[PDB]
């Protein structure tokens, strides 16, 4: 049969794209002569961003203690609560600018292997790149979303000597997190979830029996 | 709508080949004293590797001995690979029984609401199990027939020493391939065929009750 003939060579490619975007997703994939790897390049950023939160951190617990003292120089609950929230604050602007660069470097992992291929590829591609293009966009605005959400959730903490020793412990605590979730966020959405919404897409393409031939000219 | 039955089936084909990937990669779920399908494998070599060194001291001495007293001489190593042929054979057979057992599984969880639909993805499973478990097979006896290629005492010993050695190693090697790595990758091809004949979607969702 023709009909089995042609099913091999449009079926057998589809595939082949997906399972690249596995390796893609682990570190694994296939790089260029003296490129560097995604998931490497990623851990490079996210150096620097450990360093600006650790000076946070020591600002903090004293900013508390001298308060106090240059006043002089717990009915105010409301007010020195307010003074450590603040601190933490301060860090959210920082975070969303990693973000940016990160995404970068993964459209020309992704690229390169829809291109590979698909590239002899002028009416029935296409469409199935728009996927790719449309994912893109989508995963950034909602990775910054959840940076900026993650510094919401930190406004939430943790005798006069009793006030003062449980509202310090909230502040501690705080740097930690936010070292370690802003640099977290960038490669959940713009590696992991970006690469498998595309694959269930790319599934759609094979429906049309009667464009069949009609999908399969390479001339 | 013809807009729900075009989606439903789309994203139902996607998922199954994720779960494809994890079975062939050595992390699905399994029982406490049981054991993972990877090192199933292992066990099975591991009998294969002691028969065949029992072989390699037989020619070397063999050949000596006539020699205190032509092709009569070199008719003596193509005897000796020969006698390994049958045994290599046998071991393909079983290994590619436990691999094929997980991916049937994956089929069934997501075609069970379209009784038409399944019966042509799970005979998908089978082509391919079919078609590489033959070719397996054929590699095993060819590399055989191979080794059937052979004062000049000396030079010969050289290749009745060396024989032996390959045939050890070369049996579990298609084994491994065969039925682990093609098996998964081309079923998954397999799978979008279903969806050519959107005039046929009535048909495929047609219930039990009223055939």
């Given at each position: 049969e023709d009909e089995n003939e042609k099913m091999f060579f449009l079926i057998d490619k589809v595939n082949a794209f997906n399972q690249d975007i596995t390796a893609l997703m682990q570190g694994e994939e296939t790089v260029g002569e003296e490129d560097i790897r995604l998931f490497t390049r990623l851990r490079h950023e996210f150096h620097k961003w450990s360093t600006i939160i650790e000076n946070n951190f020591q600002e903090g617990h004293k900013i508390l203690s001298r308060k106090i003292?240059?006043?002089?120089?717990?009915?105010?609950?409301?007010?020195?609560?307010?003074?450590?929230?603040?601190?933490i604050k301060a860090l959210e602007e920082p975070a969303v600018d990693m973000l940016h660069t990160v995404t970068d470097m993964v459209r020309l992992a992704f690229t390169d292997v829809s291109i590979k291929n698909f590239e002899e590829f002028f009416n029935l591609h296409r469409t199935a790149k728009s996927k790719i293009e449309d994912i893109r966009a989508e995963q950034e605005r909602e990775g910054e979303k959840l940076i900026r959400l993650h510094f919401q959730?930190?406004?939430?903490?943790?005798?006069?000597?009793?006030?003062?020793?449980?509202?310090?412990?909230?502040?501690?605590?705080?740097?930690?997190?936010?070292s370690s979730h802003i640099p977290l966020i960038i490669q959940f959405f713009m590696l992991q979830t970006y690469g498998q919404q595309l694959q269930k897409a790319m599934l759609q393409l094979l429906q049309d029996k009667d464009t069949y031939s009609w999908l399969l000219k390479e001339r």
């Open positions: 003292q240059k006043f002089e120089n717990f009915v105010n609950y409301r007010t020195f609560e307010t003074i450590v929230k603040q601190q959730m930190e406004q939430i903490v943790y005798s006069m000597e009793e006030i003062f020793q449980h509202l310090m412990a909230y502040h501690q605590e705080a740097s930690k997190r936010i």
